[PDB]
């Protein structure tokens, strides 16, 4: 779809067999969720944002469905105030900006 | 223009008579710059992101040029790791997401 920006661009996600909502975030390089439970091995990672850094778990090659579109890629899990879909996933679903 | 997401969506800005680069950020409600010098009165504000909060100065009704498009609105000034154009400004320039 086309999504305008009068409201936060929140969409419905399926990841790890669980349903969540997440913000389409062109300012995020990576994809971050709080409170999902993903299977298998992970690596600890520190990431930076406004207000400093955050410790996350890094999971690789995770399938995700983003507003009905399929992608696979790295998902970070940690205490983000809102779930975000970043460019690693947005490029796979053909998402662009336009003005 | 249309902007794809293979790279960070960075554009050229003029604000307060100064030239800067900033990220088109659909996950940002507000617009934040580091190291600009804006005129007039401001109000201190605490804002939240990943990794916690940040103290900013809030300036209202600031003119800005975003990739050649004119807007006016609130600009926050404080120690962001990258300058961001948020939805308060993006709606004025007709920016949309599309997939
Ligand atoms: C700050 C930008 C540049 C980056 N962030 C993406 C922005 O869109 C975040 C999303 C958000 C919204 C709300 C609360 C939040 F906690 C977070 N917006 C944000 O903080 O807005 C703030 C600020 C603007 O006005 C209002 O609107 C929401 C809130 C409030 C004050 S990020 O989440 O830190 C992130 C994401 C992925 C990523 N992947 C990385 N990988 C390695 C480097 C390669 S680093 C990295 C860092």
> What share of the residues of chain A does DSSP label as strand, in percent?
over 45%
Q: List the bound ligands.
A: the ligand CC(C)CN(C[C@@H](O)[C@H](Cc1cccc(F)c1)NC(=O)O[C@H]1[C@H]2CO[C@H]3OC[C@@H]1[C@H]3C2)S(=O)(=O)c1ccc2nc(NC3CC3)sc2c1
Number of strands of chain A: 9
What is the terminal-to-terminal distance of chain A? 16 Å
How many H/I helices of chain A?
1
Largest interface: A-B, 40 and 40 residues
Q: Could you say what the CATH architecture of chain A is?
A: Beta Barrel
Name of the level-1 CATH class of chain A: Mainly Beta
**Which structural category fits the helices and strands of chain A?**
mainly beta
PDB class: viral protein/inhibitor
Keywords: Inhibitor, viral protein, VIRAL PROTEIN-INHIBITOR complex
Assembly: dimeric
Entry title: X-ray crystal structure of darunavir-resistant HIV-1 protease (P51) in complex with GRL-001
């Amino acid at each position: 779809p086309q999504i305008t920006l009068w409201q936060r661009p929140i969409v419905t996600i399926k990841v790890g067999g669980q349903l969540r909502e997440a913000l389409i975030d062109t300012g995020a390089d990576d994809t971050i969720f709080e409170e999902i439970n993903l299977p298998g091995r992970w690596k600890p990672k520190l990431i930076g944002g406004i207000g400093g850094f955050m410790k996350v778990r890094q999971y690789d090659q995770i399938p995700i469905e983003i507003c009905g579109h399929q992608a696979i890629g790295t998902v970070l899990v940690g205490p983000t105030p809102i779930n975000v879909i970043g460019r690693n996933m947005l490029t796979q679903i053909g998402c662009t900006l336009n003005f």
